[PDB]
């Protein structure tokens, strides 16, 4: 259960843009700075940056 520390304003149709305070179900990540998360609201996927999130 990670948390968006920064407002990600993605501009592509792949990564989902989120805001601060929004929770994101992290999926796989432990090598680069880009991880894949899944929002528990609508049920979609969106690669969220690690600099805009952290374990909390």
């Amino acid at each position: 259960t990670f948390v968006a520390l920064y407002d990600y304003e993605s501009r592509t149709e792949t990564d989902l843009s989120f805001k601060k305070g929004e929770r994101l179900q992290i999926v796989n990540n432990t090598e680069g700075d880009w991880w894949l998360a899944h929002s528990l609201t609508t049920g979609q996927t969106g690669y969220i940056p690690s600099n805009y999130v952290a374990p909390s």
Binding site: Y6, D7, E9, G32, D33, W34, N51
Partner: peptide, 9 residues
């Protein structure tokens, strides 16, 4: 994939 420029600050 240059990471997003953190909010200036």
């Amino acid at each position: 994939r240059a990471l997003p420029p953190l909010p200036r600050y």
